[PDB]
C-alpha cells in the first residue's frame, strides 16, 4: 500500500517521494468536492521546464470532461495549448486549468487559484 517514502513519477521526469498522506477531509477541495489524489510542489516546474506536465494536465482535464483520450503526439500542429484551453472553457472550467480550492482544514478559499487536473502518474 503506498506510504510515506514511496517513489512516484509522472511521465516528465517529475519524480518524488510521498511526504505525507492526508485524508479526504484534510485535502483541499474544489467547489464541486473534488480533492487531488496527489499534490506536487510548484517549485518542481520552473527550473525543470516540464511544460509537458502542465499541457498533459490540461489536456487530461479536457479528455476526462469530454470522454475521449487526449492526443499528445510530439509534433502535432493540430494540438496546441490555446485549442486545449478553448476546449476546457466549454466545460465550465477556467480555460488554463486553474480552480478555486478551499483549505481542507478551515474551509476558507485559497487566495491563489490552484492548477489541478488529471495527470498520469507512475508508482516506481
Amino acid at each position: 500500500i503506498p506510504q510515506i517514502g514511496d517513489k512516484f513519477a509522472s511521465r516528465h521526469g517529475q519524480k518524488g517521494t510521498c511526504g505525507i498522506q492526508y485524508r479526504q477531509e484534510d485535502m483541499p477541495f474544489t467547489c464541486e468536492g473534488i480533492t487531488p489524489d496527489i499534490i506536487i510542489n510548484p517549485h518542481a516546474i520552473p527550473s525543470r521546464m516540464t511544460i509537458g506536465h502542465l499541457i498533459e494536465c490540461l489536456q487530461g482535464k479536457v479528455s476526462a470532461n469530454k470522454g475521449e483520450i487526449g492526443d499528445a503526439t510530439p509534433f502535432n500542429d493540430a494540438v496546441n495549448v490555446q485549442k486545449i484551453s478553448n476546449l476546457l472553457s466549454d466545460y465550465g472550467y477556467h480555460l488554463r486549468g486553474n480552480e478555486v480550492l478551499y483549505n481542507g482544514f478551515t474551509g476558507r478559499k485559497i487566495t491563489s487559484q490552484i492548477f489541478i487536473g488529471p495527470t498520469y502518474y507512475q508508482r516506481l
Binding site: 500500500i1 506510504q3 482544514f105 478551515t106
Partner: protein, 115 residues
C-alpha cells in the same frame, strides 16, 4: 512496517487524558488546552467560537505535527474572565448551535419531503 493503526487518530491510549490544561506563564489569564485524538474539526470550531467572546483576548489552535494526533488551543481572556470558563462557554455555544441546526435541518427535510 511503521504504519500506525488508523484508529490511533481517534482512540485514546490507556492512561492518556483527552484534555490537559496548563497555565501559560508568559501573559496572565492564558491557558494551553492540549486535546488528544482530535484534529482541525474541533479545533477550528472551538477557536472560532472563542473569537466571538469579547472577553477572549487570544484564541488560537495548532496541530503541532500532522503525524501526531493532538491539538493545542491557546486561550487568553480578560482578567475578570477565565480561559477555562471561556472554553466551556464556547463548547456550550457550539453544542446549542448544532442542536438548533439539527432541529432546523429536520424541519427542512420534513418540508421538502412533504411539500
Amino acid at each position: 512496517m511503521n504504519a500506525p493503526p488508523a484508529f490511533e487518530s481517534f482512540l485514546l491510549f490507556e492512561g492518556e487524558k483527552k484534555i490537559t490544561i496548563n497555565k501559560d506563564t508568559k501573559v496572565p489569564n492564558a491557558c494551553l488546552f492540549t486535546i488528544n485524538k482530535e484534529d482541525h474539526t474541533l479545533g477550528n470550531i472551538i477557536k472560532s467560537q472563542l473569537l466571538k467572546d469579547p472577553q477572549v483576548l487570544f484564541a488560537g489552535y495548532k496541530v503541532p505535527h500532522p503525524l501526531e494526533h493532538k491539538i493545542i488551543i491557546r486561550v487568553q481572556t480578560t482578567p475578570d474572565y477565565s480561559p477555562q470558563e471561556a472554553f466551556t462557554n464556547a463548547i456550550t455555544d457550539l453544542i446549542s448551535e448544532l442542536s438548533l441546526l439539527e432541529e432546523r435541518f429536520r424541519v427542512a427535510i420534513k418540508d421538502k419531503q412533504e411539500g
